[PDB]
Amino acid sequence: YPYPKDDAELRRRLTPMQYEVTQHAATEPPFTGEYTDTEDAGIYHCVVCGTALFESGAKYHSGCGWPSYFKPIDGEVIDEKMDYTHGMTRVEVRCNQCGAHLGHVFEDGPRDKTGLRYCINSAALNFEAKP
Amino acid sequence: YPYPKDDAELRRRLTPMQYEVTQHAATEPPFTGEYTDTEDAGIYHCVVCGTALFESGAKYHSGCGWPSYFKPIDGEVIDEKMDYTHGMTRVEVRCNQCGAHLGHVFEDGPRDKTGLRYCINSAALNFEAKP
Ligand SMILES: [Zn+2]
Ligand SMILES: [Zn+2]
């Protein structure tokens, strides 16, 4: 990952939730994240490295309990990796710039669009409003 | 449970984490809770109903990532229920007065005491200092 890892800096700058989610692949509980129901126009950036990851225009109502997007801003900003943790097989999504754990992607997204549900922890993101 | 249920009031008074943990059996991520490492003398109360649940004297450093106690204040204050969720069989611990989800109890606690680890979400509790 291009963005250099500096653990000391992250621990100083990130909240415990942000750090655990992004660095230890923790999962914020459903219906507790800041951006779960956000509908404002803008861009969701990696909380770690600031790379733009998701646009408000791709955010949709999934009812799953986390921010949910049907596509990232482009095919380059996300890295996918199989995840066999927690007695499940899933596809983890990471920031391709810095490697931050973001969430998971599922094949139960909008059938009228991409069919994909990018299920992202709020604590992995920071929102830049664009009114 | 005797303590009368008002979801609307809870939604207003509790933070989303406290609400989802106690009412929907969410689990705070490990290493994110406020009280995980707390050593101060005092009493941990149910965040929902205020019942005294655990004493600082029964709190110990388990290293598991959540507040851990080897016994509650007395046996009467906790209800236990088998929990078959999340692909595991565990013993849920609830507040006996209001039914709040608190956490789980495991049999890997200090053998020089109860041998039990009551593993409790910080977000289910509110600490009262008795210094
Ligand atoms: Zn990043
Ligand atoms: Zn209670």
Author numbering:
A (entry chain A), B (entry chain B): 10 to 140
Publication passage describing the model:
The Microcapillary Protein Crystallization System (MPCS) embodies a new semi-automated plug-based crystallization technology which enables nanolitre-volume screening of crystallization conditions in a plasticware format that allows crystals to be easily removed for traditional cryoprotection and X-ray diffraction data collection. Within microfluidic Teflon tubing or the microfluidic circuitry of a plastic CrystalCard, ∼10–20 nl volume droplets are generated, each representing a microbatch-style crystallization experiment with a different chemical composition. The CrystalCards are manufactured with materials that enable a balance between X-ray transmission, optical clarity, moldability, chemical resistance and surface energy. This system produces diffraction-ready crystals by allowing crystal extraction from the CrystalCard or in situ X-ray diffraction and structure solution using diffraction data obtained from samples within the CrystalCard.
Using a fine gradient, the crystallization phase space of a particular protein–precipitant combination can be carefully interrogated for crystal optimization or mapped out to show the transition from precipitation to microcrystals to single crystals. Crystals formed in a concentration optimization gradient screen of 30%(v/v) MPD, 25%(w/v) PEG 1500, 0.1 M acetate pH 4.5. The protein concentration was 22 mg ml−1 in 20 mM HEPES pH 7.0, 500 mM NaCl, 5% glycerol, 2 mM DTT. However, 10–20 nl plugs contain enough protein to generate crystals that are large enough to obtain useful X-ray diffraction data. Crystals grown in plugs are typically 40–200 µm along their longest axis (the channel dimensions are 200 × 200 µm). Protein crystals can be extracted directly from individual plugs in the MPCS CrystalCards. Crystals were removed from the CrystalCard using a 0.1–0.2 mm cryoloop, cryocooled (using the crystallant as the cryoprotectant) and subjected to X-ray diffraction experiments.
